[PDB]
Amino acid sequence: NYLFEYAPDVLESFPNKHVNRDYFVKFNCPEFTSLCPKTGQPDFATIYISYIPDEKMVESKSLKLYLFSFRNHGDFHEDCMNIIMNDLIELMDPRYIEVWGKFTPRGGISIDPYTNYGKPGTKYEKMAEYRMMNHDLYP
Amino acid sequence: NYLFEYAPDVLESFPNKHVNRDYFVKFNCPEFTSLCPKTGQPDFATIYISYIPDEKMVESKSLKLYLFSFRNHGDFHEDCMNIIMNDLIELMDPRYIEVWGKFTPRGGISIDPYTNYGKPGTKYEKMAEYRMMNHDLYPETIDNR
Amino acid sequence: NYLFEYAPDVLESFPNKHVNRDYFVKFNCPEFTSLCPKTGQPDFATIYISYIPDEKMVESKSLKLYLFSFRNHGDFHEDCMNIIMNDLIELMDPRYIEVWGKFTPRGGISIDPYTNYGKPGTKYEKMAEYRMMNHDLYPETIDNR
Amino acid sequence: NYLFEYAPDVLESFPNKHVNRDYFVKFNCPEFTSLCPKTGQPDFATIYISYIPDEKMVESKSLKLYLFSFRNHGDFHEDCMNIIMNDLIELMDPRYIEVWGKFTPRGGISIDPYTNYGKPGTKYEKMAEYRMMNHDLYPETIDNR
Amino acid sequence: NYLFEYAPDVLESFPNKHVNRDYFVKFNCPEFTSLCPKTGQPDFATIYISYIPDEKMVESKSLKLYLFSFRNHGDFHEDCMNIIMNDLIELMDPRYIEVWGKFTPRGGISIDPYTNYGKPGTKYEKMAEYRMMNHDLYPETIDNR
Amino acid sequence: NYLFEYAPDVLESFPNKHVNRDYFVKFNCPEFTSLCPKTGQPDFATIYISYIPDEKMVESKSLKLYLFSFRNHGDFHEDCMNIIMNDLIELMDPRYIEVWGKFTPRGGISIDPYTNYGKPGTKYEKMAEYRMMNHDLYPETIDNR
Amino acid sequence: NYLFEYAPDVLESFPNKHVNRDYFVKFNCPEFTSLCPKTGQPDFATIYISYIPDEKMVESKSLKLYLFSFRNHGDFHEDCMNIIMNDLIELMDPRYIEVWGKFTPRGGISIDPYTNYGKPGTKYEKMAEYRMMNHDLYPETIDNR
Amino acid sequence: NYLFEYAPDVLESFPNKHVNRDYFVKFNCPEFTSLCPKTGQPDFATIYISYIPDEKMVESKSLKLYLFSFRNHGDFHEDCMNIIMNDLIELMDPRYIEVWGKFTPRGGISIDPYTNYGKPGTKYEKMAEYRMMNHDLYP
Amino acid sequence: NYLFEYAPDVLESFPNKHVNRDYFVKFNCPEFTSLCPKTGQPDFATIYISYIPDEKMVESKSLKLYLFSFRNHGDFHEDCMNIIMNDLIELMDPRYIEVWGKFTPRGGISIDPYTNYGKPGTKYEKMAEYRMMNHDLYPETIDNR
Amino acid sequence: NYLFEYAPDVLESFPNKHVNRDYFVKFNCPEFTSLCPKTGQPDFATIYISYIPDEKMVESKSLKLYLFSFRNHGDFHEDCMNIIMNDLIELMDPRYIEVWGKFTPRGGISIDPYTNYGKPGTKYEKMAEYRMMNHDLYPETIDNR
């Protein structure tokens, strides 16, 4: 009973009851897999998704169906992370978000795509830039 | 007989005998459990609470009884952490507090909410903000085993 | 072009380099996944496969593909570990084989099936029998994280 | 929506498609909790349950509900392990089963009861006596942390 | 209040509801401490106590009270493991019991006494001998850190 | 003989032969134990104490004697880490010092107090604040085993 | 001032208060050091001694002083283990003793001598022989790190 | 200053001062390497050597030069172990000996050659057979 | 046909698949060995090599061979780790590279050299500089076994 | 044949063939032992020594003899770490050095002194202050075993 072709319509949110404070929520996602765009051969990752909400929070079970909808779909690793992040923004429009994918290595290349976004003009935009900068120093 | 419905009133406090300095007290709470509000399904976590006290300290036995009262209480994980923190800010009026909840997976996915608080306009507010900006730069590895 | 419906036909063998000898060959697959028959929801495991060949060895590439062929097959985990063992037995006529499966949890519970075989009448059958009587005397610590 | 008063009847089985082979299945159950009989206070454990089937497997979702069904039932740990074992023997009439429960400490002491059973008059009874007599020759280091 | 000088009387038992089976129960006890009989200097150990009950079980809190009773009691470690064993034999009349204590080092050398018992005349007696013959065949690495 | 009620006087110091440099010395102290002030029930912790000396160092055996002096002394853990810190500040007048205690759990919850200090007015004072601001950013996994 | 030349005379013993049963006492001795007889080069080991006592027990402090006396004493590792055991058989007249020495590598190569002894014509002689026949069936992994 | 072509003459022994008792000595040897006989490509192992002496013991430093003398020599893994064991017998003529080589795996094959020998006719001959039998059950 | 005298010429490169990106590529060599210049005696290590490519990647086969070419080269370990880094830099023009070396002990002491580089002027040079300032803040426990 | 009374003069250096690059070299030294100054009793440690060279490397065989040279010399642990650091600064005049000593426990307490140095007025002095101020933010678990 499961969309395994790409399905952002599945994502869902509930209100944040604590808009006064900045807090962090992290989803750990070790069951992520999707198709590789050229070969067609499955790829696998743990996805770590962290966000500071503004007014809307993503619902867990809807994030899980969302993540499954990748199982039978192909696009690259970097884009894949931007896709996930952008839908999550579209969904929540949060103060801050980051999506870090850790793919099983293939040739010694730990292909570990990292993206983030802070709300434009705000102190989050600078936190993005700062966290991004940090990311490489010890990934 | 224990009360397993939500009970902020249990919480008790005693005077900090060492107000003149900043120190950190941590509680490790591996035995935490509650209900998913939509499902009724139980959910489990380890909660870390750390706080620099001002004039009042939380008494452990009461923190135990307080965390038990979640046992048959539905709420989303993110709310619980915020609610636990608020009851503690209300009881204690701390310089600084953080509550970090690490829940066991559902549907493959586990939720780690982290909230903090510094006393407004003080060096602790800026502290809350530095530890938020910097929270979890190096996320630990999670395989669900 | 990869088959994501169950596909035994993709398994291939080659001549064992030392028939003279008993050596274990070990395969370790951290990315097996299949469907769960009741609900359609995906399942995840690391499969450990060890065997002592007679004349034939499984071509390690083709085993990878074989395992990916489970990605849309729907079966229970116990059954899967037995299908994989059987298919490998049919392909290879091994002296000894075992397949151990470590699933990620569902509902808080994870399921580790372990199945073995040794050639009937041989000391390999004695070996499989002893390994079953002694399997997992000390289960590893599991907290779903 | 869920039963949390003790309910054996929630247990479900399905046929073993591989009756003619001995294999092991393990359930890791890190989310168990019940009440202490005198005090009323919550107990916590990881339960490991490994069993060899004959004709009936226990369905995991149903084992889940069955384990939940202990959240508000009080019993001593030793009892609980034997009750769980007994309701699983009832349900499935298996060749061999073991239940090993590892509880969080109280008063500094933690209690880890281990119970097994092999179908009487068979090699499995001997496996039980063997696994019992060799039980925990090397107990894992415990420091309560 | 809490008796800190030695106290067998505290120990309490309750019937075994499952006498018709053999099962093990273990107590992990990482908080034990006692006195050295010449010097008067405290010593510390983790004690493991595993036993197969017959009709009576030891009540957990009474055990914590019984082990507290060594806090200001002088004895050598070898004697303490035996005394502890004897008081529990006397209270319980168990089918089998063992007491393994791991002490923290002194002058560079730690002492790990291990004593057991089985009901004289029975298969449990032979158990004790087997477990004693085979005790600690692979001793763990200790580096005093 | 050995004083088991609290005793600052025992502490002793000796000159630092290397005052013209900053260096750290740590004491690992896994054998500490004390009383709970309402109940009277013993508690246990590993305490880490690290400090940067100025002119005086703490003499190791005197420290063991000083920590013994809490064995029959009632206090809460938060106060003990501070008292310990104050007696060593008073004895030593160190450039920097911290005392981190990790207690064993009670009713499921362990308390890890962390306090520090640096000479007021100096760069060490800023050290203390930095180490306090950045304390325990990644708290360790505790499961009470 | 301590004596660091070989000194069997230091060893002291006290009565076993529990002669009526067989129990094992283990000493972990991580701090053992001596000299290579040809080189003068110091050599280091961890020694495990385990023994079922008869009427006499070795006193730890004396075992400490005894093992120190190797500090400036040359002998091959295999001899030391045999000599340590003999001094202990001479002092104690035990039912059973084993001494297992694990030395740190020289020239890439480390030497693990293991010796044992059962009281002649008794069930302990047969014990010495069973634990010799079976010694180290599963050697632990050594990489020199 | 080191024989790296095969050199059994290097081995050396000293008397056993305790001929009354059966005891075990084990050498752990993680620095073993030699040449593979066909390809010519280096192979690597930990060698665990255990013996119960009779009257003569092997000297450590001479066992180390002996082991080095393999560095530049080629023969198979199984033979290699029998070679080491046989020289050690020739040297010591012990009550019991076993040589277990654990080579870095190459294709998933843990090529872990195990040989032993008990003194012919004695209770060691049966201990050999028994330990050999044990070896496979959990190697 | 393999060269066992030092042979840089055997290293080969290929086009980086994602120049667009920063990914670490990691090589892990558990079987490096070379000669020690003073004494002629062989030396052993595990070499860890990580780098961020620009346009070129080292062909992993040829790196294996390159490393085997040290088998009769005589040099110190610090020098070796630098020769290997240099040769890799010359071959690949990497953005960032580091080589960490873990030798087996000689005389009781083991030597772990660590060397890095980042393209001069780039943020990679900032990266190498920070990694050197922060390298091995917590050395792993080493007991030569 | 060997010096075991303290002897700085045994230290030897050789030129750095890679002067124009900062790199780290670590010495793991698990075999260290000295005498306690008052008691006369043997002390034991693992010493970690990491340093960045300028023009002179310390030769390891000579560091070996230098460390042996402490076997019969008495000093306190804190002193010994500073003496070792100082004789190594003398010998090599390096960009940066640290000596971290981890000693076996006495009276329950073990002492782990950490000392560093960066060449004064340079970036290395800042690295020392940094590595000092961030020293041991997470102390390793110690249980004395």
Ligand SMILES: *C(=N)c1c[nH]c2nc(N)[nH]c(=O)c12
């Ligand atoms: C149940 N506890 C539950 C169900 N869906 C959830 N979504 C989020 N974000 N958090 C929860 O705690 C959820």
Ligand SMILES: *C(=N)c1c[nH]c2nc(N)[nH]c(=O)c12
């Ligand atoms: C889904 N795969 C599923 C649902 N219930 C199960 N029960 C058992 N025993 N095994 C499974 O794989 C199950």
Ligand SMILES: *C(=N)c1c[nH]c2nc(N)[nH]c(=O)c12
């Ligand atoms: C509470 N669960 C409790 C209290 N006392 C106990 N004693 C034993 N043996 N087992 C328990 O589970 C106990």
Ligand SMILES: *C(=N)c1c[nH]c2nc(N)[nH]c(=O)c12
């Ligand atoms: C003190 N507890 C002490 C001192 N010496 C001892 N020797 C032995 N064997 N056992 C002890 O418990 C000892």
Ligand SMILES: *C(=N)c1c[nH]c2nc(N)[nH]c(=O)c12
């Ligand atoms: C007993 N030691 C005890 C009981 N309750 C406590 N609460 C706090 N906060 N600290 C303690 O040390 C406590």
Ligand SMILES: *C(=N)c1c[nH]c2nc(N)[nH]c(=O)c12
């Ligand atoms: C020095 N301790 C040394 C030198 N050679 C030895 N050979 C053997 N077998 N044992 C030793 O302890 C040796």
Ligand SMILES: *C(=N)c1c[nH]c2nc(N)[nH]c(=O)c12
């Ligand atoms: C032999 N390789 C050797 C001998 N002495 C050494 N000293 C140092 N520092 N490094 C080495 O590789 C050495």
Ligand SMILES: *C(=N)c1c[nH]c2nc(N)[nH]c(=O)c12
């Ligand atoms: C013995 N080595 C000893 C005795 N007391 C000591 N105190 C300190 N601080 N350091 C030591 O190394 C000590």
Ligand SMILES: [Mg+2]
């Ligand atoms: Mg995990």
Ligand SMILES: [Mg+2]
């Ligand atoms: Mg885990």
Ligand SMILES: [Mg+2]
């Ligand atoms: Mg623990």
Ligand SMILES: [Mg+2]
């Ligand atoms: Mg240890």
Ligand SMILES: [Mg+2]
């Ligand atoms: Mg733990």
Ligand SMILES: [Mg+2]
């Ligand atoms: Mg090791």
Ligand SMILES: [Mg+2]
């Ligand atoms: Mg080691």
Ligand SMILES: [Mg+2]
């Ligand atoms: Mg330890």
